[PDB]
mmCIF file of N, CA and C and ligand atoms in Angstrom:
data_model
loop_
_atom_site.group_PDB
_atom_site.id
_atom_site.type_symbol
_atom_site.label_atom_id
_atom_site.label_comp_id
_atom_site.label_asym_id
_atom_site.label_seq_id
_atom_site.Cartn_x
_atom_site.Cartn_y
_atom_site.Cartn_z
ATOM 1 N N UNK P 234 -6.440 -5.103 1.472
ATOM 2 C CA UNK P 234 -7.747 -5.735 1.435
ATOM 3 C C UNK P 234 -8.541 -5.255 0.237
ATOM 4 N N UNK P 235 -9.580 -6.359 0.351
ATOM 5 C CA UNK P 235 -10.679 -5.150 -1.047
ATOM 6 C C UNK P 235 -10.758 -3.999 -1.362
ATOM 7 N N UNK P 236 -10.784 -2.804 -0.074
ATOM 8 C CA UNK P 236 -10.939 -1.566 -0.420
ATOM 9 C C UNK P 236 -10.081 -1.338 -0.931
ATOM 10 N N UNK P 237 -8.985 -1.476 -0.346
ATOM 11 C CA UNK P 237 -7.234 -0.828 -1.169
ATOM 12 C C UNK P 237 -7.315 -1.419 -2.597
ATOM 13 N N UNK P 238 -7.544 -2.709 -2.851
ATOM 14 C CA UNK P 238 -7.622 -3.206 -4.405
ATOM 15 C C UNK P 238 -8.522 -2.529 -5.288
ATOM 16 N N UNK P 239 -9.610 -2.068 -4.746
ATOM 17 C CA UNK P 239 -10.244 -1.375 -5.979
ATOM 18 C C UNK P 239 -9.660 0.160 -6.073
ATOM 19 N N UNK P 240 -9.282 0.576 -4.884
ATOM 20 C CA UNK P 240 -9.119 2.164 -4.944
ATOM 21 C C UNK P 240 -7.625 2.229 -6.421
ATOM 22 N N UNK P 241 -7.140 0.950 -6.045
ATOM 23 C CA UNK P 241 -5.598 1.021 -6.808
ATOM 24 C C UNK P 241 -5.923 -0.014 -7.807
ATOM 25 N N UNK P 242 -6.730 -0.293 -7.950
ATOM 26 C CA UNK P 242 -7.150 -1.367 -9.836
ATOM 27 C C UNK P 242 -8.359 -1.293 -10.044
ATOM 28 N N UNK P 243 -9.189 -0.254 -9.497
ATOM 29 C CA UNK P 243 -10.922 0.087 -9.831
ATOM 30 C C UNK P 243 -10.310 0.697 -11.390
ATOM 31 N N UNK P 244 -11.879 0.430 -12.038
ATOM 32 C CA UNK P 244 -12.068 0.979 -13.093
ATOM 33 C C UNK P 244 -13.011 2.469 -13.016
ATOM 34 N N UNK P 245 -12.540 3.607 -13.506
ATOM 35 C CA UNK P 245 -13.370 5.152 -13.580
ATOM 36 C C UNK P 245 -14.804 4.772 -14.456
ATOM 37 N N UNK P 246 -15.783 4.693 -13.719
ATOM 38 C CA UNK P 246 -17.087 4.412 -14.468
ATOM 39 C C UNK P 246 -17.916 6.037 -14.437
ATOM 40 N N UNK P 247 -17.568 7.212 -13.994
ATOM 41 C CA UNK P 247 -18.559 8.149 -14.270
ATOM 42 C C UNK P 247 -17.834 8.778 -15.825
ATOM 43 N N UNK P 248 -18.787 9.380 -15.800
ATOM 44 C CA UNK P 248 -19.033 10.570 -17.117
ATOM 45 C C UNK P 248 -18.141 11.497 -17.367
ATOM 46 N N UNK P 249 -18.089 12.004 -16.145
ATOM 47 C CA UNK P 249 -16.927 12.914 -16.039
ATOM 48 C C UNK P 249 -15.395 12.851 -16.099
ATOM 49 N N UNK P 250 -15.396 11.543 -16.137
ATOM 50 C CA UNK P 250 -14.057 10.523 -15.095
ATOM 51 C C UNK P 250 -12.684 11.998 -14.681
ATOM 52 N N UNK P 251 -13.579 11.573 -13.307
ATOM 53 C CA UNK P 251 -12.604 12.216 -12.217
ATOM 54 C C UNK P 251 -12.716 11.391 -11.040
ATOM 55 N N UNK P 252 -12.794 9.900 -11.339
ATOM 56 C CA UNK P 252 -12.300 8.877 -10.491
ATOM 57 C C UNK P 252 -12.756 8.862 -9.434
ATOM 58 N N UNK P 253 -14.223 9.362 -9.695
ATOM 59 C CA UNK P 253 -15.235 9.249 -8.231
ATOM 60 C C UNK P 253 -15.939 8.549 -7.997
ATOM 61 N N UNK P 254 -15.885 7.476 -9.178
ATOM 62 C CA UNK P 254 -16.367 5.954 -8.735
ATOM 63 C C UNK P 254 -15.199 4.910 -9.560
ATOM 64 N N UNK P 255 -15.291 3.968 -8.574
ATOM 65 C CA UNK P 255 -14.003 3.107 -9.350
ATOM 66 C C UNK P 255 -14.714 1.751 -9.193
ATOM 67 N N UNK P 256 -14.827 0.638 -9.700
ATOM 68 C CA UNK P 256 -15.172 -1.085 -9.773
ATOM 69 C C UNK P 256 -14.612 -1.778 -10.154
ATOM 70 N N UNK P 257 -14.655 -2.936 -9.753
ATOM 71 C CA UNK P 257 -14.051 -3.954 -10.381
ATOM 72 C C UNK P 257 -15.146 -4.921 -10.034
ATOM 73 N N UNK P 258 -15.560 -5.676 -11.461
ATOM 74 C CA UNK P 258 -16.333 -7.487 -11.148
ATOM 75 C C UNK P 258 -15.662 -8.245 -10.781
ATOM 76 N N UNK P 259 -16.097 -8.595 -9.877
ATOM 77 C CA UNK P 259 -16.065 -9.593 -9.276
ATOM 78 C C UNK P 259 -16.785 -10.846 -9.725
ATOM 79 N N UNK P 260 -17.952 -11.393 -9.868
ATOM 80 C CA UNK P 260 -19.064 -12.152 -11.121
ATOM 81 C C UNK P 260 -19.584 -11.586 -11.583
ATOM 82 N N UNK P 261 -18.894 -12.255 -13.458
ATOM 83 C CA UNK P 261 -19.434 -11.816 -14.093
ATOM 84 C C UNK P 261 -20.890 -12.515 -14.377
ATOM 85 N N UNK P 262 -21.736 -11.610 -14.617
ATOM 86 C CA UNK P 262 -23.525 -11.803 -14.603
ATOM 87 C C UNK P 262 -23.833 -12.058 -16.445
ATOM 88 N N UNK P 263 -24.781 -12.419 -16.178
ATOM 89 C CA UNK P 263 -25.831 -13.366 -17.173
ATOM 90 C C UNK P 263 -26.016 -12.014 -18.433
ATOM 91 N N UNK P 264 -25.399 -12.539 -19.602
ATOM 92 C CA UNK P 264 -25.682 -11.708 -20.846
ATOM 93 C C UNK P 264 -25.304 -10.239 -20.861
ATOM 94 N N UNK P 265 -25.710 -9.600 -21.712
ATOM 95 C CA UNK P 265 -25.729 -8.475 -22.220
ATOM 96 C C UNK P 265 -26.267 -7.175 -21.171
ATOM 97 N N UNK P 266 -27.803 -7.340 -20.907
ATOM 98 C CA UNK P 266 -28.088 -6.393 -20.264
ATOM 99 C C UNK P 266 -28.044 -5.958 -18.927
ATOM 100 N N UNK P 267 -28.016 -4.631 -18.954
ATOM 101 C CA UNK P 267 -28.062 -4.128 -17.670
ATOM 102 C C UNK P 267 -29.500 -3.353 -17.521
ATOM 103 N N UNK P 268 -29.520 -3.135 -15.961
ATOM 104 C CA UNK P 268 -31.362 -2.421 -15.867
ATOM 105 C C UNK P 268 -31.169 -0.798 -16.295
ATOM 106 N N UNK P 269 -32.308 -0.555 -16.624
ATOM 107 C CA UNK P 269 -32.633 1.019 -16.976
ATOM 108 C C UNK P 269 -33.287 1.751 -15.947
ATOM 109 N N UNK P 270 -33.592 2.969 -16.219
ATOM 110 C CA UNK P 270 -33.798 4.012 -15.503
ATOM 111 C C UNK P 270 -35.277 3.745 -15.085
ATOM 112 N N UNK P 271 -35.591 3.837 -14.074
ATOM 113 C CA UNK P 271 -37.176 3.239 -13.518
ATOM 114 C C UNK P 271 -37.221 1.972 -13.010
ATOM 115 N N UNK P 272 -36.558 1.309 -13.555
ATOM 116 C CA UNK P 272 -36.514 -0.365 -13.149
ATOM 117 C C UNK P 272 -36.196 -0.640 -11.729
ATOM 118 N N UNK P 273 -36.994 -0.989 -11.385
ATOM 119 C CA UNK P 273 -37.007 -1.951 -9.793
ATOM 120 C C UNK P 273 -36.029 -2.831 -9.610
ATOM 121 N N UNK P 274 -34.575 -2.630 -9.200
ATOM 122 C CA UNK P 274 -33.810 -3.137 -8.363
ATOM 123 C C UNK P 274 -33.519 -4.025 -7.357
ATOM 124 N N UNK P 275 -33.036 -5.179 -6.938
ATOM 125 C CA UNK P 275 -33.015 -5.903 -5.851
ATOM 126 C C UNK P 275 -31.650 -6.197 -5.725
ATOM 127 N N UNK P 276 -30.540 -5.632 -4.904
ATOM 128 C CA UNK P 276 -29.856 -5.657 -4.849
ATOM 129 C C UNK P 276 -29.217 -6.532 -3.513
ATOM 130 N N UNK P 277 -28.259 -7.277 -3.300
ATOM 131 C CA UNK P 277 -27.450 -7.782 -1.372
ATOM 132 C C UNK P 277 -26.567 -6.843 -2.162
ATOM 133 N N UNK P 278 -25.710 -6.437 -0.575
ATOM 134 C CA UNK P 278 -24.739 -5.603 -0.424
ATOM 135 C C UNK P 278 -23.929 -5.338 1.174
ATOM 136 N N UNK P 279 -22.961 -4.887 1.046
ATOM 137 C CA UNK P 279 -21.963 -4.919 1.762
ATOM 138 C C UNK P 279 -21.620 -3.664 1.932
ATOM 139 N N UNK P 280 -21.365 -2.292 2.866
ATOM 140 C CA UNK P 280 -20.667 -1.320 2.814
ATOM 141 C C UNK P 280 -19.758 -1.402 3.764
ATOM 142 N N UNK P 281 -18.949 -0.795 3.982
ATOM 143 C CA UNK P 281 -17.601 -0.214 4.903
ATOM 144 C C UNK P 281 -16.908 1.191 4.655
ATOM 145 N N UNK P 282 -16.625 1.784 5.795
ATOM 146 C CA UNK P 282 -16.094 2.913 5.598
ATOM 147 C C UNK P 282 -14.416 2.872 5.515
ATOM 148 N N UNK P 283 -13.865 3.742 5.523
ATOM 149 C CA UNK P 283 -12.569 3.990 5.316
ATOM 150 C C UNK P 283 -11.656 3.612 6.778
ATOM 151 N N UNK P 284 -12.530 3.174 7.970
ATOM 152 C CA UNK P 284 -11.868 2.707 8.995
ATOM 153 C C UNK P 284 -11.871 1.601 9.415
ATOM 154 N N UNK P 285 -12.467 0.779 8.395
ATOM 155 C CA UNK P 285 -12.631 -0.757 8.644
ATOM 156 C C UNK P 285 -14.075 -0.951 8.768
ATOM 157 N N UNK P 286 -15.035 -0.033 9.471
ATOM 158 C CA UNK P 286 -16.165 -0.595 9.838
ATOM 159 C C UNK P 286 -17.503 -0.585 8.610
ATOM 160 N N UNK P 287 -17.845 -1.831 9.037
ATOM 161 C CA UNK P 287 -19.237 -2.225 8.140
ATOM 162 C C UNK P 287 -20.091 -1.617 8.986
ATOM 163 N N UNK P 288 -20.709 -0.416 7.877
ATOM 164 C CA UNK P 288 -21.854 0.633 8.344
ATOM 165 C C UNK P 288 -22.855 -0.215 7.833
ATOM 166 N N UNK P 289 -23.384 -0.977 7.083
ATOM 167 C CA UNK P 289 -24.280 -1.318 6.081
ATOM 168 C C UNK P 289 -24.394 -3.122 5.908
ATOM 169 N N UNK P 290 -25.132 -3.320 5.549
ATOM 170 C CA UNK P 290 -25.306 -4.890 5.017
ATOM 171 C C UNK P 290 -26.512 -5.494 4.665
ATOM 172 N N UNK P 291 -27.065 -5.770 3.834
ATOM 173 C CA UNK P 291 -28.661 -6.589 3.154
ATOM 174 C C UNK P 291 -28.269 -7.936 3.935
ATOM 175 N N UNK P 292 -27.512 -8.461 3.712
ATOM 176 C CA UNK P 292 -27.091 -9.961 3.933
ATOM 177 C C UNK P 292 -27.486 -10.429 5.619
ATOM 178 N N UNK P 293 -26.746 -9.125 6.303
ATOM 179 C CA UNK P 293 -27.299 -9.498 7.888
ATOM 180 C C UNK P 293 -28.732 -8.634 8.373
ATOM 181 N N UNK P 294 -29.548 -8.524 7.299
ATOM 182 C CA UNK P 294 -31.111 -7.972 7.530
ATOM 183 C C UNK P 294 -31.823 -9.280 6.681
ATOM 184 N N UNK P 295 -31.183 -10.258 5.999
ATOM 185 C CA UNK P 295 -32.003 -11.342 5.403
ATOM 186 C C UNK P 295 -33.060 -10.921 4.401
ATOM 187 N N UNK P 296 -32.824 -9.509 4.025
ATOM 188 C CA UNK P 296 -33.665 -9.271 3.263
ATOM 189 C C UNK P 296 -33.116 -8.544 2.307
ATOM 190 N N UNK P 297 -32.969 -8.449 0.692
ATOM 191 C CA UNK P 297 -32.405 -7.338 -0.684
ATOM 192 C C UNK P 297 -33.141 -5.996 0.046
ATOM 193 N N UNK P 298 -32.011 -5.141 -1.055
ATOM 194 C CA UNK P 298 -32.566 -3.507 -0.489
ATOM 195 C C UNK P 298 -33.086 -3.358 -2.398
ATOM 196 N N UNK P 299 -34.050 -2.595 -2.035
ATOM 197 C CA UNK P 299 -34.390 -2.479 -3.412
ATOM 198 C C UNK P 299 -35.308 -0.778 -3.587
ATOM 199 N N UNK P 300 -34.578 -0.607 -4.897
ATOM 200 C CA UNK P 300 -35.219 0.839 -5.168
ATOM 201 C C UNK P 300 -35.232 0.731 -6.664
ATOM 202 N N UNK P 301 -35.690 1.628 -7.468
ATOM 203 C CA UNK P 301 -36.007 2.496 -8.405
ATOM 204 C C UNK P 301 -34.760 3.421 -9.004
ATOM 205 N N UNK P 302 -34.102 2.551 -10.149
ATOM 206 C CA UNK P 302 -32.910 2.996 -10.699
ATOM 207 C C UNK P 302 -32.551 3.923 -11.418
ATOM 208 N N UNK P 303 -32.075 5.119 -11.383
ATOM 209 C CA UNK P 303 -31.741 6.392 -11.732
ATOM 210 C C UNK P 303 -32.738 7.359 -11.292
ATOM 211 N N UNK P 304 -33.309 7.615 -9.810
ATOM 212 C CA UNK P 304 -33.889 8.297 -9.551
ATOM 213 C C UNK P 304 -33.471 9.162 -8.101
ATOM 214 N N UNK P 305 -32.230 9.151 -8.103
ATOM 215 C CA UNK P 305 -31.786 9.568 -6.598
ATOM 216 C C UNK P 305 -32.627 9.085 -5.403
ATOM 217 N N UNK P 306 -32.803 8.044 -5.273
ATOM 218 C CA UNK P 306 -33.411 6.747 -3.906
ATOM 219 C C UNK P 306 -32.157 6.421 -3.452
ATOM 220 N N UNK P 307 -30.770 6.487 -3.879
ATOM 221 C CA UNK P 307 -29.312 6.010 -2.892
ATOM 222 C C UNK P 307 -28.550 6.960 -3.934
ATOM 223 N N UNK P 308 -27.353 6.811 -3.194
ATOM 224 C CA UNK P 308 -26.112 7.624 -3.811
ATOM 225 C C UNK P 308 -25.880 7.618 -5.305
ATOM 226 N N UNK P 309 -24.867 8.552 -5.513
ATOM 227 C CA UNK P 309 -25.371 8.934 -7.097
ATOM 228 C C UNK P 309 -24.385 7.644 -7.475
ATOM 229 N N UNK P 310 -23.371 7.642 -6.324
ATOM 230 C CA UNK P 310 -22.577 5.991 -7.218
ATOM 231 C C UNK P 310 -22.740 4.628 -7.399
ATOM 232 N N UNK P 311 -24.216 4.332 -6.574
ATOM 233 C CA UNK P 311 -24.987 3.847 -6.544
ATOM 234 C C UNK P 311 -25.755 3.329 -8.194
ATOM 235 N N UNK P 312 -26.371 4.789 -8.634
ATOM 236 C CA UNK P 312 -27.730 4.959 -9.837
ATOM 237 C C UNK P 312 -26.091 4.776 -10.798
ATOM 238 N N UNK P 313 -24.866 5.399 -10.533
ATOM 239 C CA UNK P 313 -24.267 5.175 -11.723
ATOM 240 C C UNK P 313 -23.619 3.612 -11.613
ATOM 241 N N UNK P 314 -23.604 2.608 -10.800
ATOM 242 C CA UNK P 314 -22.697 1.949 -10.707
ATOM 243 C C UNK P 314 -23.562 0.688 -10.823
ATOM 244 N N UNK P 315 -24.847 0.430 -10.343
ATOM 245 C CA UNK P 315 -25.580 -0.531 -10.511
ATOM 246 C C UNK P 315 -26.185 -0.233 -11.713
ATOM 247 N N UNK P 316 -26.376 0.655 -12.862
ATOM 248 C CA UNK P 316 -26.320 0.955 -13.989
ATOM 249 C C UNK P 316 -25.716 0.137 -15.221
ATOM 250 N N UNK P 317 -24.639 -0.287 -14.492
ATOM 251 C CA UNK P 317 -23.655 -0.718 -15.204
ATOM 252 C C UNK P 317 -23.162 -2.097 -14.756
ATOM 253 N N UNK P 318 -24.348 -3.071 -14.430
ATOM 254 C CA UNK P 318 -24.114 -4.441 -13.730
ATOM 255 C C UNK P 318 -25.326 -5.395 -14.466
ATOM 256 N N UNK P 319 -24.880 -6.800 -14.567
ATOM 257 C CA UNK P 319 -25.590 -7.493 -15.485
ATOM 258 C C UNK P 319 -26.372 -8.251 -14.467
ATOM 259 N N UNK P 320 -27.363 -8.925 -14.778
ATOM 260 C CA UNK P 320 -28.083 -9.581 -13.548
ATOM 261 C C UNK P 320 -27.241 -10.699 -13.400
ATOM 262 N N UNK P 321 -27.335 -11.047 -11.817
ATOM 263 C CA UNK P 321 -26.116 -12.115 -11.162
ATOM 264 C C UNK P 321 -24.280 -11.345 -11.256
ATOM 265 N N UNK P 322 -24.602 -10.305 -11.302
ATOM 266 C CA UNK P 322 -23.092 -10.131 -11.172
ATOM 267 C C UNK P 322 -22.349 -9.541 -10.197
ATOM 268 N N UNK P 323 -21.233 -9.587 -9.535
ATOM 269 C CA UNK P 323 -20.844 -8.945 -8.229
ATOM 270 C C UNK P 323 -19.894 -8.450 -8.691
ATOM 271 N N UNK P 324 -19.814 -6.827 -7.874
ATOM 272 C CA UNK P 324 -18.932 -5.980 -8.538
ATOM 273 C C UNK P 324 -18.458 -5.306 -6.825
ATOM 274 N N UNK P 325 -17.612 -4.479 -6.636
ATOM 275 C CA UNK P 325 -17.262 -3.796 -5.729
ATOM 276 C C UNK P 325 -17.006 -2.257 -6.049
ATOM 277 N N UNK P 326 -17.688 -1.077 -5.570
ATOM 278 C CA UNK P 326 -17.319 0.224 -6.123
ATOM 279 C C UNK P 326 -16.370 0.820 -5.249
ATOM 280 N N UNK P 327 -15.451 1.745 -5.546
ATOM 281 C CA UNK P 327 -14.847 2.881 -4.382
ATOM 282 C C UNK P 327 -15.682 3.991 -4.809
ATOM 283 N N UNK P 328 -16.504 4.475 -4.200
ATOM 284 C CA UNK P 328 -17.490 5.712 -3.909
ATOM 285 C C UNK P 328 -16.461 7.209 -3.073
ATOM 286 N N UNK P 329 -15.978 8.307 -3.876
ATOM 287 C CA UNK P 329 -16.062 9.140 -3.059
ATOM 288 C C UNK P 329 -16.811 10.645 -2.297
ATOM 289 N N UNK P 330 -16.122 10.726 -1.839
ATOM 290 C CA UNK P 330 -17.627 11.774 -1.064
ATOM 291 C C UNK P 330 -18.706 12.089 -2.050
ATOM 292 N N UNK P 331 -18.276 12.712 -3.167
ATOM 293 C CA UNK P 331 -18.990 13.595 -4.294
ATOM 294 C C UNK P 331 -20.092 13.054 -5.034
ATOM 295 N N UNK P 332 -19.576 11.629 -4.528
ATOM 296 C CA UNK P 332 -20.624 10.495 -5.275
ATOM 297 C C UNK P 332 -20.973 9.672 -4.019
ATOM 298 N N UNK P 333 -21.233 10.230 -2.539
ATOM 299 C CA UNK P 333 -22.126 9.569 -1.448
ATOM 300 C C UNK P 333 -22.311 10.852 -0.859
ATOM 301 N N UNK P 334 -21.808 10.877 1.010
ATOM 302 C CA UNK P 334 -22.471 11.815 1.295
ATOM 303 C C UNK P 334 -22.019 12.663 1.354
ATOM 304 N N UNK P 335 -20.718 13.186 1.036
ATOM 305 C CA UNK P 335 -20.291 14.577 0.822
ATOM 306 C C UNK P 335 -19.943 15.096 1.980
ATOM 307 N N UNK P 336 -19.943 16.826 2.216
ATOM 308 C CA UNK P 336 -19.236 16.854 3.648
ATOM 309 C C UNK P 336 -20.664 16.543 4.594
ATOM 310 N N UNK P 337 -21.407 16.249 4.222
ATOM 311 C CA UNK P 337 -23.162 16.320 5.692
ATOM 312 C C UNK P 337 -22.703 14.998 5.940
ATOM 313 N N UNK P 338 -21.713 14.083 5.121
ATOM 314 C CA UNK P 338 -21.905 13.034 6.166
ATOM 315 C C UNK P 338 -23.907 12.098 6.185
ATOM 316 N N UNK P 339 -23.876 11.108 7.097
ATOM 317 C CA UNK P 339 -25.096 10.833 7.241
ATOM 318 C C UNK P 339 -25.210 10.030 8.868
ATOM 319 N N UNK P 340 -25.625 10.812 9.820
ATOM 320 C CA UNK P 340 -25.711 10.232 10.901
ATOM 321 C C UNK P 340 -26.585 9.242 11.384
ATOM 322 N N UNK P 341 -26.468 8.320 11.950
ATOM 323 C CA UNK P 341 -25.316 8.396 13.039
ATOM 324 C C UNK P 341 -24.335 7.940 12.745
ATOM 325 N N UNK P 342 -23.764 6.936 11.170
ATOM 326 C CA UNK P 342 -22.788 6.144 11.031
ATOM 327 C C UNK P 342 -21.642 6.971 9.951
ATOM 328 N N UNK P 343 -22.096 7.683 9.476
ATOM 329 C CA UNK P 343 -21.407 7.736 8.085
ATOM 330 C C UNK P 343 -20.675 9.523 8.294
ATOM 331 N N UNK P 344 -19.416 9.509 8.102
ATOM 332 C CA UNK P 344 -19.017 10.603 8.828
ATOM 333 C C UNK P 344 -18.778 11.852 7.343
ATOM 334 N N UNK P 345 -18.940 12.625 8.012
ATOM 335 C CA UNK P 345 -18.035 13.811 6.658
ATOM 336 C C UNK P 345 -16.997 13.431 5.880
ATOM 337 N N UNK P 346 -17.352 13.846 4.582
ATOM 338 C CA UNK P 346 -16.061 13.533 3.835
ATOM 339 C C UNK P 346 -15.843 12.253 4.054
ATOM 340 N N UNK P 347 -16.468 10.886 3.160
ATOM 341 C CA UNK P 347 -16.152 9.652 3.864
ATOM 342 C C UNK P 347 -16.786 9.464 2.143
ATOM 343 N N UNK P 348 -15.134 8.359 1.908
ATOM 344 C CA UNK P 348 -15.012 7.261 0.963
ATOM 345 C C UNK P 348 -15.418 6.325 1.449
ATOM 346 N N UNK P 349 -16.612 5.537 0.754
ATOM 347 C CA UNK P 349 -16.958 4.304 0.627
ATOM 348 C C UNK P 349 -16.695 3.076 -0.106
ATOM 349 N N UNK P 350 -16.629 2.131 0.621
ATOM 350 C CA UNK P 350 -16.529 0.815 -0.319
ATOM 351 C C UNK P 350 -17.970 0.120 -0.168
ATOM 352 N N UNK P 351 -18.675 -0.135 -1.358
ATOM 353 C CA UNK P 351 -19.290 -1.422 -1.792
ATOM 354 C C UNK P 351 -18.770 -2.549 -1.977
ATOM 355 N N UNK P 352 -19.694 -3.395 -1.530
ATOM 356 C CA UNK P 352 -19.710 -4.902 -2.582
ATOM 357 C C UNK P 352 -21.180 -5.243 -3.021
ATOM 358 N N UNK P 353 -21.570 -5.270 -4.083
ATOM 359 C CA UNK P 353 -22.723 -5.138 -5.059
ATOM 360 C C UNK P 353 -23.102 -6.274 -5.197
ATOM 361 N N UNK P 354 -24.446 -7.296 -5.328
ATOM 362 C CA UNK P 354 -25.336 -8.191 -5.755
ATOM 363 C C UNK P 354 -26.300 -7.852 -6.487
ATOM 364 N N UNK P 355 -26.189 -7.589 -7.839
ATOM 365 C CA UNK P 355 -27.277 -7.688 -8.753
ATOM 366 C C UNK P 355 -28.336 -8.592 -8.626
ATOM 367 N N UNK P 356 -29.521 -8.678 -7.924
ATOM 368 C CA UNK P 356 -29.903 -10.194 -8.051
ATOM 369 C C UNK P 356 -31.007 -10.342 -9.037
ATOM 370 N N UNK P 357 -31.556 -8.853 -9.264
ATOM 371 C CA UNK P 357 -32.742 -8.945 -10.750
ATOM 372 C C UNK P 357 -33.189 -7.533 -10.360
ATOM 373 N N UNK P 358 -33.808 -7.344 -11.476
ATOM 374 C CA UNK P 358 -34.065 -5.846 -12.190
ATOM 375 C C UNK P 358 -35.331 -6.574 -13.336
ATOM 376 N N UNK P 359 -36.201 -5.627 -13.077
ATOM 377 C CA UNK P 359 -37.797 -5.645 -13.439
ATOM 378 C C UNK P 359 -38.168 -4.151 -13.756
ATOM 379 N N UNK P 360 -38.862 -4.094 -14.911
ATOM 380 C CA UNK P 360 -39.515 -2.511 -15.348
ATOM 381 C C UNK P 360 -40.644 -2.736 -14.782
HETATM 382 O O1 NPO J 579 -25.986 3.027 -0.706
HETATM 383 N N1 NPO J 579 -27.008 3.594 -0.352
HETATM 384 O O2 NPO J 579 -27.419 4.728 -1.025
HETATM 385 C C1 NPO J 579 -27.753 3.072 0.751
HETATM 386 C C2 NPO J 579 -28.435 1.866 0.660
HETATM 387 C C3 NPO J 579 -29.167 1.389 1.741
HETATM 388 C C4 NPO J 579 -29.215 2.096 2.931
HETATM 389 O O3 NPO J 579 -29.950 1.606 4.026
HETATM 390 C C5 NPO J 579 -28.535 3.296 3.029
HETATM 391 C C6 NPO J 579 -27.811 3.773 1.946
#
């Protein structure tokens, strides 16, 4: 499924590359830019954990989740991965612990030591 496809054809998008975030686009988005650091975010999205289950979803709340980009407001694979997305474009990340929640986990859904999958909606970015 998706998760297995990106974990085994994601692309290494951190700094460090030690393959703690991996993506692949899915649509490709409108031009050149991507948002900067401060910029107001509006993102749909999709999560699932490593056991099948969808912890997460914008789509079944009818409403974008939106934060403030490169400021630790969501996971660091998050500020690095929507970083790197053009407006209108859908991408999917493999997130691991180091780049979500690490061993604390986040209760009640999200367990220790837990690889994540995204699916990303850029839908606009505003300074
Ligand atoms: O990916 N994230 O950092 C998130 C985004 C939204 C949410 O309700 C919880 C975590």
């Amino acid at each position: 499924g998706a998760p297995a496809t990106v974990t085994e054809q994601g692309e290494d998008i951190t700094s460090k590359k030690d393959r703690g975030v991996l993506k692949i686009v899915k649509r490709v988005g409108n031009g050149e830019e991507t948002p900067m650091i401060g910029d107001k975010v509006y993102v749909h999205y999709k999560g699932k954990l490593s056991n099948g289950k969808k912890f997460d979803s914008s789509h079944d709340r009818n409403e974008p989740f939106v934060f403030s980009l490169g400021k630790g407001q969501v996971i660091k694979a998050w500020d690095i991965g929507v970083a790197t997305m053009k407006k209108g474009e859908i991408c999917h990340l493999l997130c691991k612990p180091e780049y979500a929640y690490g061993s604390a986990g986040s209760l009640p859904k999200i367990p220790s030591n837990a690889t994540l999958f995204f699916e990303i909606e850029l839908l606009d970015f505003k300074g």
